[PDB]
Structure 1
Amino acid sequence: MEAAHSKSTEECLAYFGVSETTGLTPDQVKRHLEKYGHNELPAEEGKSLWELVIEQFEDLLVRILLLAACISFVLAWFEEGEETITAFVEPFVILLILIANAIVGVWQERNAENAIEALKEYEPEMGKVYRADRKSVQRIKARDIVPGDIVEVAVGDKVPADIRILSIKSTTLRVDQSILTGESVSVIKHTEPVPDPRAVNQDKKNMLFSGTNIAAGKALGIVATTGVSTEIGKIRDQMAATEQDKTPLQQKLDEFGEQLSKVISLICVAVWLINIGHFNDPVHGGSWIRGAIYYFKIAVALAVAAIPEGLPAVITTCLALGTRRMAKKNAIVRSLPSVETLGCTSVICSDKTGTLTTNQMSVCKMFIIDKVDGDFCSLNEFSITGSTYAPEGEVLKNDKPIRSGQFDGLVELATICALCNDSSLDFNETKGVYEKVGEATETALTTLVEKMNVFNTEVRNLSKVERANACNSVIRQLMKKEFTLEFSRDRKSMSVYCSPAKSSRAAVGNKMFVKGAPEGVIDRCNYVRVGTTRVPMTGPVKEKILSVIKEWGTGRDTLRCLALATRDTPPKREEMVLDDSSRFMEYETDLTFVGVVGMLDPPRKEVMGSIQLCRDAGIRVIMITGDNKGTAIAICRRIGIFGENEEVADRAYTGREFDDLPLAEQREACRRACCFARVEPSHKSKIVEYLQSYDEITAMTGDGVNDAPALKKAEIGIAMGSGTAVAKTASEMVLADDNFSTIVAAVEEGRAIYNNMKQFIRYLISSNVGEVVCIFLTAALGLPEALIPVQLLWVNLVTDGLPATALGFNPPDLDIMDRPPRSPKEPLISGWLFFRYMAIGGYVGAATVGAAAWWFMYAEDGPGVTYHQLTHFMQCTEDHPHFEGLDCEIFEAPEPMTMALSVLVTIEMCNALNSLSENQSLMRMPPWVNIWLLGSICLSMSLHFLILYVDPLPMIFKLKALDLTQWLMVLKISLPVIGLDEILKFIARNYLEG
């Protein structure tokens, strides 16, 4: 029964046809269970090994390397070489990479906790129903509750299903529905119908939504919906439905994968066309099982030359150290790939209560009477600092700290605030922070009289645990609380009867202490207290009081004003009926006005500056709240979203107002409006989707259950450390310190990290370019020598993995936060950069061929002085008279591959020096600006010497030769490549402008 809020109690009972006094019958429970199912949110399967791993293998590049590993087993089958039969282990290496990388992804998926499971902690095990079987209430399992059941709830109870209230047994029914509205304030429900069919949960003041707990009271209702059909079930559906898109940079890697598969697949067959040298090479033989293997010997090699193996390892470690660096800023990152995505955030959506504000009700202003001389009436107004329940702060008058005990009116104001109060203030030693005990509204009064200290009580050397209620107890011991007249809806106020308990009994006179909504209380105040004295209430006086109260209720500050009064001559205790709550308003008559307090959930001190910093960084901040519109706007003015006097007309909408706009006017309404109030949990997710429709990377910040959908729909979800568990589970990052400025710091770190990522990404990709060009030249000139598939792995994994990781520690740009947010879909390589890498790739790629070619043509220690016919080395066995003065094994000497690998590694170190910047020269950018860069080059070169000057590793590859005749020649290209890139870099820095 969805329209249950708009139908009367009798109409709701008539829908299911059950008498309010008696419960459903077993037949009805059978049928309603076979129709509506059980009352439980469905679980989620989440993970599957057999399918998660294969999903990790679904990527394209891993399909290329995987397709190359088996071929590498085929090359490994070959008994031809075996001496190099033992070197058959390259595929396993090629294999052990994939496996390893795969596992890392699985590990990233290992931490994915079930957020629906966290949402299921808000459904209770047992529930209380009345039924036909038994006159006495039945405590059953809440999952067996079907619609139509008569359900009972009491204090502390968790509501099991969405329930229309039939009769409230207590004076009031206060429910904490922060699960859906994000507000710790407890709403006062009723049984009247709510005619609006499209009312939001905040307006359904006659319903009891599943997952919310009863703050105080006892009531009876009939169940409307169960299971997924409840309002929390909408949250579950929206949390299982919103799939997370791939990281923008990850999308770049994927399309790079596609084009890479195209280019590899086209080159491998493109070699078949240039087969002028394959028409008739052997003396009689042709293409058989031995001959065709060449077309694969290049293939796998070409693959390992194109695939940047180890890039996921480098980005994984880089993002890991980013997580460690932000961890010192109290920013716990749950998803590694999200860090990058935080840099390019264009819009930040944010909750208010608990996120932008402290979620701790604080009394800002207060006023008492000063002088009453005829029509004139002056007031004493005070402001109170402190934005938390902790008794920290002082009272001020005209921006000057003043002791409260000097004003006789403030003493009585604190006396009313302390006695007429059911709440206490506790100090959590485990969390190390003061927590409210009771309602937030009254707790604000408790901490208020803690801040005031009207009797000048020594509280400096007090323990932090006893500091919580130090002054409240002082006031409690002065007047004994006989009984309390509880809050009722008819009079919108509550009162307390107190006796002196003084030295001489109650001869000083009993007094009644009343607090409540302003108009209803002031209308019953026939007297006004001026310090110690009492004067009759008049027109001009109450017009001044109501004037100031109206000035505080609206405008810049939007405080919740409570009026406080006493009764100097209350009636006798033996003539007050305490059962009938409607009579209490007569008991609270003939009052004496005292003062007024103003409450507000104040913002965190760290927020406003953060909003200015995002504004400076081109990031717009949007507030999305379940709280009232006036309150959210008044907070926006303090935060810096709106001006102190800015007219907010078309810039702030409510969920009901938002839904009334055409879908177009909503999608465009998210571009201008910066504040959204009184919204349902679905509305936040809808706004996030709308902002993402503009291809804008948006981030959501929250702390409650109602923020869970948005937190999933946003590209980056940021949860508060003091927030709910379900909000943390559906987020990519947590702020343990609850500070809002660490978001700004986190964005800065993300941008700097990406700026450092383009560097080593371009480095590895360029090395792959040179390798591809080299394998192509060696393939077209018939010289598979000087390169092997095994070594290209170690080069792209170890000797290049270290400098690439070192590039992650480059100093960030100075004016990095004065620039607007980065474009989402923009290439890492542009035309000029693509031209630069296209030239240097063929240059350094031809270097590696020139190593072997030079070792054979112009060399004093290279016996293979062939001079000509070097390209036709395969004929050496069938045309031995052609190749005299040498052995058939000299073609595969250790020096060609040692020199090719040498110029490769050195060109890669110098190229890693070129990767320190894109448009900045090396003369103005000293290489020692990054100690980790030169350190990684020193360690990669040291590991290269370890490859050469050892016994195992050479057996796979080749043997090293002397240096008096070898390193002198590696400098033909190992060093002038820096000059090439230096000219190419000098051109665009000056020729581009003018």
Structure 2
Amino acid sequence: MEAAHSKSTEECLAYFGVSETTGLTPDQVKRHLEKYGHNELPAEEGKSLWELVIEQFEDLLVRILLLAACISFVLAWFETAFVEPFVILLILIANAIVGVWQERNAENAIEALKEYEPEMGKVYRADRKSVQRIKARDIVPGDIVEVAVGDKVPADIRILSIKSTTLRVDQSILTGESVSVIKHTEPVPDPRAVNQDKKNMLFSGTNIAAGKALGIVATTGVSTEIGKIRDQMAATEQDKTPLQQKLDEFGEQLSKVISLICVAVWLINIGHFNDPVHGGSWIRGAIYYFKIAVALAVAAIPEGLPAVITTCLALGTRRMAKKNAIVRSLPSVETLGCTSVICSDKTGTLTTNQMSVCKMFIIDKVDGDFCSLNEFSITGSTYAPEGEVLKNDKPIRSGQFDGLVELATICALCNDSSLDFNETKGVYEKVGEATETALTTLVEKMNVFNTEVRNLSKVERANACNSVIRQLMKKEFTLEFSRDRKSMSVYCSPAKSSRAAVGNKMFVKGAPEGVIDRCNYVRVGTTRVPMTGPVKEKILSVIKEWGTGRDTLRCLALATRDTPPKREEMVLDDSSRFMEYETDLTFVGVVGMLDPPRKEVMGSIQLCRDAGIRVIMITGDNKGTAIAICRRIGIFGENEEVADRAYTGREFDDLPLAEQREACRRACCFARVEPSHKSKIVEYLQSYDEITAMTGDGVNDAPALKKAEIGIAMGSGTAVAKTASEMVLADDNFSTIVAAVEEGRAIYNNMKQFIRYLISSNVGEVVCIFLTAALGLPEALIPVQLLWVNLVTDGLPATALGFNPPDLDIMDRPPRSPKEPLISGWLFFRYMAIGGYVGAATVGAAAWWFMYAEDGPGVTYHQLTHFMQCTEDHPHFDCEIFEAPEPMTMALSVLVTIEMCNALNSLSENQSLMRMPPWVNIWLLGSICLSMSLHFLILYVDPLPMIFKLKALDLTQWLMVLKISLPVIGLDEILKFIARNYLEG
């Protein structure tokens, strides 16, 4: 629909043939979805596996090696050789493909996190009377959609009717208007008008700041205002994490030093260039020792270390989502394992938000100035209308008490919520606010008129007794809740009439703070008597006792205005006269309701203790109840002293600032606070360098969620509060936060053990190739042999590391320090110490066959250093058998073997093998065998060993490879040992 904003409101409905009252029928939706398509942008998806391997072969080093190989073959044509350039390519192509799959799976996984929370909108369609919450991509033009405060607007929408006094919208992401703007519903005559002047439209991707409204969808998909903009570009933020840079810089540093050592190996040979390689023509001598130099370069320059950070993320964030922690900001995953304080809200995060009225009272006798109370309890704590009203633990019929009748009448009419039976889950579920639906179930359980419900079905039984009260009193309007009075009320009139605009009542429900001052009378049965001091004090005293004990009940005060003002004399635009509309009240009773602790919170808070993480409840109960709840869930002790560890927001506002900063250091419970207080707290905690995770759900939580180190939004919450956040909890659970923090720590250790493996494996490669030249030895490894080993390790054991378990005793440690360097000075030692051993061993293996080997040439302490020409016969009276495949097949062997051993070493950062055995990761064990079966493959086949220049090894030879390799596990175990105890690691 074009220029909806210029068409009037009847005209938009008319254009699509849709009713405001019902919405699109199922058919209309199909037709319009056929015609306009989904509310999406087309999936771009432009990349290919073919292209990416080619794109990998565009860096210089890889081309150079291929050039060196080509040239070497052409030159020595005069008299493999040729297979070398071909197998180099193949291995490089092999390694490339593996590296591409690696990279792309990681990208897709990260991108897939968006699937855990699809954009949703609310529509009205004809097949259900209620509002429906559908995936937004299934919203079509002509849909009647609904928006309210906190929502992210699902399509371009003409506004139909403003349910508030004001609708107020944040369209900054669109128009740049940083402040919120207001909207109306009259038409904007100019068709060519500019977005900011369409004060009657709500554009897609835009937040609502205040208000509720109903509209008709005019355009979806690319046709939207933001669609036109999003279609141009991306527009991709394009990385990278702060840790990714700190480690990137270390990559640059290291990469440099490897370049220097790679040039330096060339110059060791620069005098050897004319020795027969052969017979030492300078160009052939040059290019040979230059394949080596650049081979080591390509194979050992590390590599894509940010690739490692963007893989542990992809693994870990997947895990967190499967555990209800949906990560929005990837940077925060690093700082998550640093969390040191968690402020959490109570209702529905530490508790469960399953309300249930489970005590209640009304007035009994009233003698002079004192009163008796009639006081009952109710069983059943789900929403199911199954349970009984007891008195003195004796079941009783609630209608026998006229006071109870009126208390139930109030709970049915001051209610905007309802019960619905879920025939698929087979359970009674809520519709609307939990605290209200708890009143709904109570009226069902009470059944004050004794209507015949035993024989109805679950579905019709679900609101049976409530419907009878409505059949009795017509609710005409509602005086919506306001803070100035802490109550709400409904103006009802009697069922049957013929004008007759009289007989009426107002039923008022709210907090005792608000309601009681406004009661002049007390209802005793059906009679009424003057409210007085000791009566007031008596009611209050019981509300207190219920708050501070055992089940800690939040209480509602229910009252009635027996002679309300005339319908003609009331006005609902300004909320602030309702406290005077609700005066001259008559007290009726009190409902007290339960909101049970989460089942896993108590044990969760204990885990935060073990892991040095402070937990701070921020609730809205009065202080007394709040503290009772903290004791119940283990924040406080059964008899702990806390007159300085828990604050009312008002109490907190009278401490000088000096002492507010103080309180925040010891406080674990804040009650009845303002949204301003969330930021205030974060500020103070920040001054002690504490990493704070704050929860939130409403638009007003946005500032503190932004300001916190880690903002954590409720999934049941608002779109507005989630954008502010780094994590969304799918299940609103506190325990989810702690599992998030644990995985944070787990991922970080997995990063640390990934890179320890990459660096030490690369360092050894550099060492052996260096020693073999610096000492004047024969090449322990042909360039071809290197890339092979490097292919196998990056493909099997390296990948297999991603599937490690969380390190042990990971939360019996305190929070990591922010700014604690990623690579400790000490740690770099291990990278070198282990790495050196690899290189030392691999050449120490080639050196061994050349000396102490019984089937080898006895050269004990004799110069293998001696120049490879060696036909002179000055120390040999043989002669050039130095080009044997045997020495290399120990070098290649020890290398391949150590790489596996040093992979077992990468199971934990500090933890031993006798504590985290080789079999903690089977995939690793699997991969080692898979590797080992290839090494054994290229060894024995017979065509291939000629290309790889290798000879078989008997059980006499593979033995030594144990004695040479295995102590790398010894060595690292020693290193790890010094760590665990001395290093405090």
Go from structure 1 to structure 2 and tell me whether the alpha carbon gap of 1:105 and 1:296 turns closer, same or farther (over 3 Å shift). Answer: closer
Alpha-carbon shift at residue 559 of structure 1 (Å): 8.6
Any idea what SS the aligned residue of 2:638 has?
coil
> Residues 699 and 721 of structure 2 are in contact (CA less than 8 Å); yes or no, is this contact kept in structure 1?
yes
Of 448-457 and 4-13, deviating more is 4-13
> Residues 523 and 586 of structure 2 are in contact (CA less than 8 Å); yes or no, is this contact kept in structure 1?
yes
> Residues 113 and 729 of structure 1 are in contact (CA less than 8 Å); yes or no, is this contact kept in structure 2?
no
Alpha-carbon shift at residue 238 of structure 1 (Å): 23
Go from structure 1 to structure 2 and tell me whether the alpha carbon gap of 1:519 and 1:468 turns closer, same or farther (over 3 Å shift). Answer: same
> Residues 75 and 297 of structure 1 are in contact (CA less than 8 Å); yes or no, is this contact kept in structure 2?
no
Separation in structure 1 between the aligned mates of residue 688 and residue 136 of structure 2, nearest angstrom: 44
Separation in structure 2 between the aligned mates of residue 694 and residue 450 of structure 1, nearest angstrom: 52
Alpha-carbon shift at residue 900 of structure 1 (Å): 1.4
Any idea what SS the aligned residue of 2:809 has?
helix
Alpha-carbon shift at residue 260 of structure 1 (Å): 0.5
Alpha-carbon shift at residue 963 of structure 1 (Å): 1.4
> Residues 175 and 189 of structure 1 are in contact (CA less than 8 Å); yes or no, is this contact kept in structure 2?
yes
Go from structure 1 to structure 2 and tell me whether the alpha carbon gap of 1:557 and 1:336 turns closer, same or farther (over 3 Å shift). Answer: same
In structure 2, the partner of 1:23 is: 23
Go from structure 1 to structure 2 and tell me whether the alpha carbon gap of 1:645 and 1:470 turns closer, same or farther (over 3 Å shift). Answer: farther
Separation in structure 1 between the aligned mates of residue 611 and residue 190 of structure 2, nearest angstrom: 43
Q: Percent identity?
A: 100
Any idea what SS the aligned residue of 1:353 has?
coil
Alpha-carbon shift at residue 595 of structure 1 (Å): 1.4
Alpha-carbon shift at residue 301 of structure 1 (Å): 3.1
- Is 1:346 the equivalent of 2:346? no
Alpha-carbon shift at residue 773 of structure 1 (Å): 1.2
Go from structure 1 to structure 2 and tell me whether the alpha carbon gap of 1:258 and 1:187 turns closer, same or farther (over 3 Å shift). Answer: closer
Separation in structure 1 between the aligned mates of residue 9 and residue 622 of structure 2, nearest angstrom: 28
Alpha-carbon shift at residue 654 of structure 1 (Å): 11
Q: Deviations over 1:300-335 (max 9, x none)?
A: 233345335587777766665555655553445567
Go from structure 1 to structure 2 and tell me whether the alpha carbon gap of 1:626 and 1:377 turns closer, same or farther (over 3 Å shift). Answer: closer
Of 553-562 and 919-928, deviating more is 553-562
Alpha-carbon shift at residue 36 of structure 1 (Å): 33
Alpha-carbon shift at residue 630 of structure 1 (Å): 11
> Residues 491 and 520 of structure 1 are in contact (CA less than 8 Å); yes or no, is this contact kept in structure 2?
yes
Alpha-carbon shift at residue 731 of structure 1 (Å): 5.4
Separation in structure 1 between the aligned mates of residue 190 and residue 515 of structure 2, nearest angstrom: 31
In structure 2, the partner of 1:367 is: 361
Alignment of 1:817-896 (within 5 A): 817-826=811-820, 835=829, 838-857=832-851, 870-871=864-865, 875=869, 891-896=882-887
Of 171-180 and 386-395, deviating more is 171-180
Go from structure 1 to structure 2 and tell me whether the alpha carbon gap of 1:157 and 1:693 turns closer, same or farther (over 3 Å shift). Answer: closer
Of 404-413 and 147-156, deviating more is 147-156
Q: Deviations over 1:242-264 (max 9, x none)?
A: 99996576455324313312321
Of 437-446 and 204-213, deviating more is 204-213
Separation in structure 2 between the aligned mates of residue 730 and residue 896 of structure 1, nearest angstrom: 62
> Residues 759 and 831 of structure 2 are in contact (CA less than 8 Å); yes or no, is this contact kept in structure 1?
no
Separation in structure 2 between the aligned mates of residue 503 and residue 136 of structure 1, nearest angstrom: 29
Alpha-carbon shift at residue 833 of structure 1 (Å): 5.8
Separation in structure 2 between the aligned mates of residue 806 and residue 432 of structure 1, nearest angstrom: 44
Go from structure 1 to structure 2 and tell me whether the alpha carbon gap of 1:668 and 1:799 turns closer, same or farther (over 3 Å shift). Answer: same
Any idea what SS the aligned residue of 1:915 has?
helix
> Residues 352 and 623 of structure 1 are in contact (CA less than 8 Å); yes or no, is this contact kept in structure 2?
yes
- Is 1:125 the equivalent of 2:119? yes
Any idea what SS the aligned residue of 2:653 has?
helix
Q: Deviations over 1:857-904 (max 9, x none)?
A: 555656898997755666579999999xxx999554433332211111
Q: Deviations over 1:453-494 (max 9, x none)?
A: 556778799766545423312433455668878889999977
Go from structure 1 to structure 2 and tell me whether the alpha carbon gap of 1:708 and 1:182 turns closer, same or farther (over 3 Å shift). Answer: farther
Q: Deviations over 1:620-675 (max 9, x none)?
A: 33567999999999987877668899999998999999999999999999766767
Alpha-carbon shift at residue 715 of structure 1 (Å): 6.2
Go from structure 1 to structure 2 and tell me whether the alpha carbon gap of 1:99 and 1:50 turns closer, same or farther (over 3 Å shift). Answer: closer
Q: Deviations over 1:542-564 (max 9, x none)?
A: 45346666899999999986543
Alpha-carbon shift at residue 369 of structure 1 (Å): 1.4
In structure 1, the partner of 2:965 is: 974
Alpha-carbon shift at residue 752 of structure 1 (Å): 3.9
Go from structure 1 to structure 2 and tell me whether the alpha carbon gap of 1:24 and 1:256 turns closer, same or farther (over 3 Å shift). Answer: closer
Go from structure 1 to structure 2 and tell me whether the alpha carbon gap of 1:871 and 1:341 turns closer, same or farther (over 3 Å shift). Answer: same
In structure 2, the partner of 1:101 is: 95
Go from structure 1 to structure 2 and tell me whether the alpha carbon gap of 1:32 and 1:658 turns closer, same or farther (over 3 Å shift). Answer: farther
Go from structure 1 to structure 2 and tell me whether the alpha carbon gap of 1:658 and 1:955 turns closer, same or farther (over 3 Å shift). Answer: farther
> Residues 309 and 797 of structure 1 are in contact (CA less than 8 Å); yes or no, is this contact kept in structure 2?
no
User: Structure 1 unaligned runs (5+)?
Assistant: 79-85
Q: Deviations over 1:725-764 (max 9, x none)?
A: 5655675654333332133233334434544554454334
Separation in structure 2 between the aligned mates of residue 141 and residue 965 of structure 1, nearest angstrom: 68
> Residues 567 and 590 of structure 1 are in contact (CA less than 8 Å); yes or no, is this contact kept in structure 2?
yes
Go from structure 1 to structure 2 and tell me whether the alpha carbon gap of 1:460 and 1:4 turns closer, same or farther (over 3 Å shift). Answer: same
Q: Deviations over 1:566-613 (max 9, x none)?
A: 467899999999999999999988764311346898875554543343
Go from structure 1 to structure 2 and tell me whether the alpha carbon gap of 1:30 and 1:865 turns closer, same or farther (over 3 Å shift). Answer: closer
Go from structure 1 to structure 2 and tell me whether the alpha carbon gap of 1:287 and 1:968 turns closer, same or farther (over 3 Å shift). Answer: same
Residue 894 of structure 2: which of 887, 898, 903 is its match?
A: 903
Of 475-484 and 341-350, deviating more is 475-484
Go from structure 1 to structure 2 and tell me whether the alpha carbon gap of 1:485 and 1:124 turns closer, same or farther (over 3 Å shift). Answer: farther
Go from structure 1 to structure 2 and tell me whether the alpha carbon gap of 1:533 and 1:581 turns closer, same or farther (over 3 Å shift). Answer: same
Of 957-966 and 97-106, deviating more is 97-106
Any idea what SS the aligned residue of 2:830 has?
helix
Number of residue-to-residue matches in the alignment: 984
Go from structure 1 to structure 2 and tell me whether the alpha carbon gap of 1:896 and 1:580 turns closer, same or farther (over 3 Å shift). Answer: closer
Of 327-336 and 552-561, deviating more is 552-561
Go from structure 1 to structure 2 and tell me whether the alpha carbon gap of 1:614 and 1:872 turns closer, same or farther (over 3 Å shift). Answer: same
Alpha-carbon shift at residue 266 of structure 1 (Å): 3.3
Of 274-283 and 752-761, deviating more is 274-283
In structure 2, the partner of 1:33 is: 33
Any idea what SS the aligned residue of 2:234 has?
helix
Go from structure 1 to structure 2 and tell me whether the alpha carbon gap of 1:142 and 1:930 turns closer, same or farther (over 3 Å shift). Answer: closer
Separation in structure 2 between the aligned mates of residue 948 and residue 535 of structure 1, nearest angstrom: 103
Of 906-915 and 984-993, deviating more is 984-993
> Residues 387 and 603 of structure 1 are in contact (CA less than 8 Å); yes or no, is this contact kept in structure 2?
no
> Residues 527 and 536 of structure 1 are in contact (CA less than 8 Å); yes or no, is this contact kept in structure 2?
yes
> Residues 718 and 733 of structure 1 are in contact (CA less than 8 Å); yes or no, is this contact kept in structure 2?
yes
In structure 1, the partner of 2:976 is: 985
Go from structure 1 to structure 2 and tell me whether the alpha carbon gap of 1:331 and 1:894 turns closer, same or farther (over 3 Å shift). Answer: same
> Residues 475 and 490 of structure 2 are in contact (CA less than 8 Å); yes or no, is this contact kept in structure 1?
yes
In structure 2, the partner of 1:68 is: 68
Separation in structure 2 between the aligned mates of residue 578 and residue 359 of structure 1, nearest angstrom: 31
Separation in structure 2 between the aligned mates of residue 225 and residue 656 of structure 1, nearest angstrom: 49
Alpha-carbon shift at residue 223 of structure 1 (Å): 23
In structure 2, the partner of 1:479 is: 473
Separation in structure 1 between the aligned mates of residue 110 and residue 316 of structure 2, nearest angstrom: 29
In structure 1, the partner of 2:563 is: 569
Alpha-carbon shift at residue 289 of structure 1 (Å): 4.2
Separation in structure 1 between the aligned mates of residue 117 and residue 858 of structure 2, nearest angstrom: 82
> Residues 119 and 726 of structure 1 are in contact (CA less than 8 Å); yes or no, is this contact kept in structure 2?
no
Go from structure 1 to structure 2 and tell me whether the alpha carbon gap of 1:965 and 1:727 turns closer, same or farther (over 3 Å shift). Answer: same
> Residues 235 and 682 of structure 1 are in contact (CA less than 8 Å); yes or no, is this contact kept in structure 2?
no
Separation in structure 2 between the aligned mates of residue 116 and residue 681 of structure 1, nearest angstrom: 33
Alpha-carbon shift at residue 776 of structure 1 (Å): 0.8
Residue 461 of structure 2: which of 467, 476, 482 is its match?
A: 467
Any idea what SS the aligned residue of 2:658 has?
helix
Separation in structure 2 between the aligned mates of residue 95 and residue 426 of structure 1, nearest angstrom: 67
Separation in structure 2 between the aligned mates of residue 571 and residue 728 of structure 1, nearest angstrom: 44
> Residues 616 and 669 of structure 2 are in contact (CA less than 8 Å); yes or no, is this contact kept in structure 1?
yes
> Residues 150 and 719 of structure 2 are in contact (CA less than 8 Å); yes or no, is this contact kept in structure 1?
no
Go from structure 1 to structure 2 and tell me whether the alpha carbon gap of 1:857 and 1:98 turns closer, same or farther (over 3 Å shift). Answer: closer
- Structure 1 vs Structure 2 CA RMSD: 10.7
Q: Deviations over 1:681-723 (max 9, x none)?
A: 9997897688678765544544455556766676655443333
> Residues 152 and 719 of structure 2 are in contact (CA less than 8 Å); yes or no, is this contact kept in structure 1?
no
Go from structure 1 to structure 2 and tell me whether the alpha carbon gap of 1:900 and 1:502 turns closer, same or farther (over 3 Å shift). Answer: same
Alpha-carbon shift at residue 267 of structure 1 (Å): 2.2
Alpha-carbon shift at residue 413 of structure 1 (Å): 0.4
Of 835-844 and 569-578, deviating more is 569-578
Go from structure 1 to structure 2 and tell me whether the alpha carbon gap of 1:98 and 1:993 turns closer, same or farther (over 3 Å shift). Answer: closer
Q: Deviations over 1:427-455 (max 9, x none)?
A: 67899997876777755643543465556
> Residues 38 and 226 of structure 1 are in contact (CA less than 8 Å); yes or no, is this contact kept in structure 2?
yes
Go from structure 1 to structure 2 and tell me whether the alpha carbon gap of 1:732 and 1:103 turns closer, same or farther (over 3 Å shift). Answer: farther
Alpha-carbon shift at residue 377 of structure 1 (Å): 1.9
> Residues 326 and 332 of structure 1 are in contact (CA less than 8 Å); yes or no, is this contact kept in structure 2?
yes
Separation in structure 1 between the aligned mates of residue 644 and residue 5 of structure 2, nearest angstrom: 30
Of 593-602 and 552-561, deviating more is 552-561
Separation in structure 2 between the aligned mates of residue 856 and residue 878 of structure 1, nearest angstrom: 19
